[PDB]
Amino acid sequence: ADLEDNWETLNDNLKVIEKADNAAQVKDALTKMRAAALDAQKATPPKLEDKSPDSPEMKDFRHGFDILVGQIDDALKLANEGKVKEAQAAAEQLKTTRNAYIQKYLGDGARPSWVAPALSAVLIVTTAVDVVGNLLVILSVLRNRKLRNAGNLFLVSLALADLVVAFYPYPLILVAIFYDGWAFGEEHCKASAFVMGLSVIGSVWNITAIAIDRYLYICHSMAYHRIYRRWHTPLHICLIWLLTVVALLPNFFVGSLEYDPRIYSCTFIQTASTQYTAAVVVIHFLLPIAVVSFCYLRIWVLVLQARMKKYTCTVCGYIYNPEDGDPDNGVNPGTDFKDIPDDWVCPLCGVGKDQFEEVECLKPSDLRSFLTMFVVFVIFAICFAPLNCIGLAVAINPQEMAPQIPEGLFVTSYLLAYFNSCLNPIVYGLLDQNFRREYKRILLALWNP
Ligand SMILES: COc1ccc2[nH]c(-c3ccccc3)c(CCNC(C)=O)c2c1
Numbered sequence: 001a002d003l004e005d006n007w008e009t010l011n012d013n014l015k016v017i018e019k020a021d022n023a024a025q026v027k028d029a030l031t032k033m034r035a036a037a038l039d040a041q042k043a044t045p046p047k048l049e050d051k052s053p054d055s056p057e058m059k060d061f062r063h064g065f066d067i068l069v070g071q072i073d074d075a076l077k078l079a080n081e082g083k084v085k086e087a088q089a090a091a092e093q094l095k096t097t098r099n100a101y102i103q104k105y106l107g108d109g110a111r112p113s114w115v116a117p118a119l120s121a122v123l124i125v126t127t128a129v130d131v132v133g134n135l136l137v138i139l140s141v142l143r144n145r146k147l148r149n150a151g152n153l154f155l156v157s158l159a160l161a162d163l164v165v166a167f168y169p170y171p172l173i174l175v176a177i178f179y180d181g182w183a184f185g186e187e188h189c190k191a192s193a194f195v196m197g198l199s200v201i202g203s204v205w206n207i208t209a210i211a212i213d214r215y216l217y218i219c220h221s222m223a224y225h226r227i228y229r230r231w232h233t234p235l236h237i238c239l240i241w242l243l244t245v246v247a248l249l250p251n252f253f254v255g256s257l258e259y260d261p262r263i264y265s266c267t268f269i270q271t272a273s274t275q276y277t278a279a280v281v282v283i284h285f286l287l288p289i290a291v292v293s294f295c296y297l298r299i300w301v302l303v304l305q306a307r308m309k310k311y312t313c314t315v316c317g318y319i320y321n322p323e324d325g326d327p328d329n330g331v332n333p334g335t336d337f338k339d340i341p342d343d344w345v346c347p348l349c350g351v352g353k354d355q356f357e358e359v360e361c362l363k364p365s366d367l368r369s370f371l372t373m374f375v376v377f378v379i380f381a382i383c384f385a386p387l388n389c390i391g392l393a394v395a396i397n398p399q400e401m402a403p404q405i406p407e408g409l410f411v412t413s414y415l416l417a418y419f420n421s422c423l424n425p426i427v428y429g430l431l432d433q434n435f436r437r438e439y440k441r442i443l444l445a446l447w448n449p
């Protein structure tokens, strides 16, 4: 067997021990691994091919295998008794020595010189804007009670999803770029990949919940007010987060959370299971994007057909808000102006709906800031559209499509996916006037006194 062929067989057998049930499955994997390590010892590496067989740098590689086999014979000693958990622990101790000391020989992967300075700058810029911007969002909702009650309790949950990724996986990846390889343990590796899972999948379901909320508030407005929103939204936020944790659990059994050297980050691997990725691409992207598209399609058609919009009085300047109605004159909140019977008059000057003009040009802050929440979704769609397309190609047939997918395109796709984590408070400030005011209000508060 070749040195390159034996290296691949030694790695996939190490993954078998993690997904193993019986100690016999562990013992079968370690016997296959011990024999593969011995055949690899009597083979010359391609990097140090010009080096002497008894060179001080080649003899050091020979001792590395003896220290690796040394870890295998201790691991099968535990497995022969019956202890699976005790043998899987020694198997990871061998996995750490195989990626740190045996990594000197060979290196099939050749990453371009641009994937390191871009990844680092992008993560620095993302982490910096994320920690400040998304913190201001948390602070603005906690202080202002008007915004908080206007269905923007989900924004705190969406901001927390964005914030957690900047505090734990992003700084470790930045260390992994500068140290060239995952400098942290296997424990921190799978955890970082899991934290990112919550942050991405949890954000999709936070956006959907917002789209359904803004769908039920604009369309079927009267039916909405009949349904309580007091204890309902903290329950919905709790539910979508527990739904995310459930959807992320098959990664632990399949073994899809591993270090990807192409993007220097420990993330989810698309080639680990074509069945699981199919669900991640369809059930956790294509399907929720489609239902959100249906939600905002019904809102934009109402704005286009000039449905519930503000109506200003051409006599006393009374602005009729469909979100408020005219409850004292019998017009319950949620009623459209086109639905109030002709006998209705202005509750200030007493002039009929005949002499009433509509407020042309919709503000982005209007209808629980539907235009701002729409942009948020469109931005999320653009950011995660290429990666889900790459995962879709692998889910169909990775025997020919996976090696054909360029490494450059993968990094470019992953760069957008990370950048999304800081973009949300930027669109809040640019489009929502109330958010813009609150951003200045927090900044001027701690800056002056
Ligand atoms: C449920 O399994 C997990 C588990 C962990 C995951 N981490 C990421 C991810 C994190 C940051 C930037 C881009 C992707 C995905 C999303 C990866 N999706 C695709 C289609 O490749 C992910 C999925």
Ligand SMILES: [Zn+2]
Binding pocket: 313, 314, 315, 316, 317, 318, 346, 348, 349, 350, 351
């Ligand atoms: Zn009037």
